[PDB]
């Protein structure tokens, strides 16, 4: 079940573009660990493109590579050691990327509060619907302890 492109931005903000860049920078030094990193990156990129469940196993590498890239950038534009022109050029870039960091924090908090924090047993004009727990508890308290319940396979684990 392939995944469309907006989901890659939905799940990682500001870190989707930095991931290819970091793979590249990690393909310029080419040490031994970097080969492992690159293989992980390519393989999981493909697998997540195909299946929408594998994005999980693709996040640890996205993160790693992103970090690497950003760190490299900082290593040049936060190393101050006067020529005020260079100071302005360092401030511009470092501030732009700290801004991006804060924006990433806000985007992440919003996404997790809006999309991945919804209960499953209770169903939320805008009232609470607790029919599943009600019916299951009735079954639990007013049925014989050795009764058999026949229902579709989707609810067997809650039943």
């Amino acid at each position: 079940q392939p995944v469309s492109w907006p989901a890659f931005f939905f799940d990682t903000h500001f870190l989707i573009w930095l991931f290819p860049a970091g793979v590249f920078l990690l393909f310029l030094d080419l040490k031994d660990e970097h080969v492992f990193v690159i293989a992980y990156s390519v393989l999981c990129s493909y697998f997540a493109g195909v299946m929408v469940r594998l994005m999980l196993t693709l996040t640890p590498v996205i993160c790693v590579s992103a970090a690497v890239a950003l760190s490299k950038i900082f290593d040049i534009y936060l190393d101050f050691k006067i020529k005020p022109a260079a100071l302005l050029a360092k401030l511009i870039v470092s501030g732009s990327f700290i801004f991006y960091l804060y924006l990433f924090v806000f985007h992440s908090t919003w996404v997790t509060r809006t999309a991945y924090s919804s209960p499953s047993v209770v169903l939320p004009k805008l009232a609470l619907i607790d029919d599943f727990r009600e019916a299951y508890y009735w079954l639990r308290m007013n049925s014989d302890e050795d009764s058999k319940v026949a229902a579709w396979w989707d609810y067997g684990y809650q039943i």
Partner: protein, 236 residues
């Protein structure tokens, strides 16, 4: 279950009710449509099923909660020393419902200090606090006193079937658990079984301060072990 705490100076009540309506059974099964129709027209008409219960708590209760065996229940409302609780389903004749209620009170109006010795406490704890017209076939009143108490005297206004003293560990109880005194009763009625169990005991300051000391001893042993294992040569 009544838990007394001197450090926070609070008395926590928590009750677990196995309830059942023994009225006339429902003929022709249960029809949700008939129930909704009755609700639609029959306004404040006396019935023989349980829709809402009215628990009467002590004055100034706080932090109420109403829970079930499948999570909590959100249909509960606490006003003016009263707590209305609506079960998940209306208890008809021959149905069961096991649930839990809890709340907290100030320990100042349940524990008095003996004037004989500053370290001798007396407690009067109610026997029942529940629905206005209910019947109890079995009661187990457990009182949990702090880790260092020593029961000294006990009195119950109505006869009991068995009284026991033990210990039961709880949060941050390292040496030995809270002192747990359990009374058993058989046939109690809501409004008729009034009375206050009275429990005299001792709690010396040395037992008061033994809790932070126990926690600090645990932390100190952990630190000494970390030091030992950090100042040991295991190199080759």
């Amino acid at each position: 279950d009544i838990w007394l705490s001197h450090w926070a100076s609070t008395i926590q009540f928590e009750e677990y009710y196995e309830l059942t309506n023994k009225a006339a059974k429902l003929s022709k099964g249960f029809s949700r449509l008939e129930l909704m129709k009755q609700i639609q027209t029959q306004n404040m008409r006396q019935t023989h099923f349980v829709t809402v219960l009215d628990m009467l708590l002590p004055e100034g209760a706080t932090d109420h909660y109403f829970t079930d065996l499948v999570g909590l229940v959100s249909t509960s409302h606490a006003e003016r020393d009263h707590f209305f609780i609506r079960p998940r389903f209306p208890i008809f004749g021959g149905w069961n419902y096991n649930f839990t209620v809890g709340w907290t009170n100030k320990l100042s109006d349940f524990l008095h200090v003996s004037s004989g010795s500053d370290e001798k406490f007396v407690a009067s704890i109610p026997i029942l606090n529940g629905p206005p017209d209910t019947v109890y076939d079995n009661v187990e009143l457990s009182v949990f006193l702090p880790e260092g108490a020593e029961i000294f005297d006990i009195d119950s206004p109505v006869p009991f079937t068995n009284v026991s003293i033990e210990t039961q560990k709880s949060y941050f109880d390292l040496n030995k658990g809270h002192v747990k005194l359990t009374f058993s009763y058989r046939n109690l009625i809501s409004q008729v079984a009034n009375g206050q169990v009275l429990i005299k005991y001792d709690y010396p300051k040395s037992s008061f301060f033994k809790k932070p000391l126990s926690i600090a001893c645990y932390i100190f042993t952990a630190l000494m072990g970390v030091f030992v294992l950090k100042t040991l040569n295991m190199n080759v």
